[PDB]
Amino acid sequence: DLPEIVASGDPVLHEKAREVDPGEIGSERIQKIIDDMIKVMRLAPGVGLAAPQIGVPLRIIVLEDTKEYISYAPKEEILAQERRHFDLMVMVNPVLKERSNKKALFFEGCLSVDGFRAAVERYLEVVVTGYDRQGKRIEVNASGWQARILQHECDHLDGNLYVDKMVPRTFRTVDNLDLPLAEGCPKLGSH
């Protein structure tokens, strides 16, 4: 049986998620959750996913970018967002910190807020500590689209969705995604 995705409104998404006990990570229980998340993130075309999104108040995130997902987008664009593919990645009790105040601005979308995208600003470089799928402590460094995803998923673990971090007037239907930005809205890209 597969637990589906919670949508905005469900308190689980707007409240800080409890840490999973290191070691208990190897548990057949939490291990199971990691499997589900990974499945769901792949079942609906998603590049990231946080425990609360399937109703689990735990600090666990999974991200992954297929060289196939990327394929379906303007090369001009995927290149601008420094979006390189990476293998599935799992992090429990992650702790994110920017490696520099360098930032970027692009359209983001959440699986708990579908049908909509919105330009949100993100750190370009970031380092995330925590534990790997098997309870061993790791420290992941990343930039570009990957850093973006990590920030997204981590935000979830704190009860935060991009909507409360978006650039005014950029909110839009996935359909009207490519329509121009109205005057005033900052330019997309980076410094």
End-to-end CA distance of the chain: 46
Q: Which stretch binds Zn ion (CB under 5 A): 3-11, 103-111, 135-143, 164-172?
A: 103-111
What is d(CA 189, CA 37) in angstroms, rounded to the nearest whole number? 30
Q: Which residues contact 57 (CB under 8 A, 6 or more apart)?
A: 12, 15, 17, 18, 51
**15 near a copy of itself, judged by CB under 8 A:** yes
Q: Which positions are catalytic?
A: 153
Which residues from 126-185 bind a copy of itself, rule CB under 8 A?
Answer: 159-161, 163-164, 166, 168-169, 171-173, 175-177, 179-183, 185
In single-letter form, the type of residue at position 131 comes to Y
Q: Which stretch binds a copy of itself (CB under 8 A): 54-62, 98-106, 109-117, 132-140?
A: 109-117
**110 near Zn ion, judged by CB under 5 A:** yes
Beta partners for residue 98, in sequence order: 126
In sign, the C-alpha dihedral spanning 122, 162, 116, 94 is positive
**187 near a copy of itself, judged by CB under 8 A:** no
What is d(CA 140, CA 132) in angstroms, rounded to the nearest whole number? 10
**7 near a copy of itself, judged by CB under 8 A:** yes
Decide which of a copy of itself, Zn ion, none touches 128; Cβ closer than 5 to 8 Å per partner kind. Answer: none
Decide which of a copy of itself, Zn ion, none touches 14; Cβ closer than 5 to 8 Å per partner kind. Answer: a copy of itself
Structure tokens at 178: 């490519």
What is d(CA 91, CA 109) in angstroms, rounded to the nearest whole number? 21
- Interface with a copy of itself (CB under 8 A): 7-11, 13-15, 113, 115-116, 159-161, 163-164, 166, 168-169, 171-173, 175-177, 179-183, 185
- Interface with Zn ion (CB under 5 A): 110
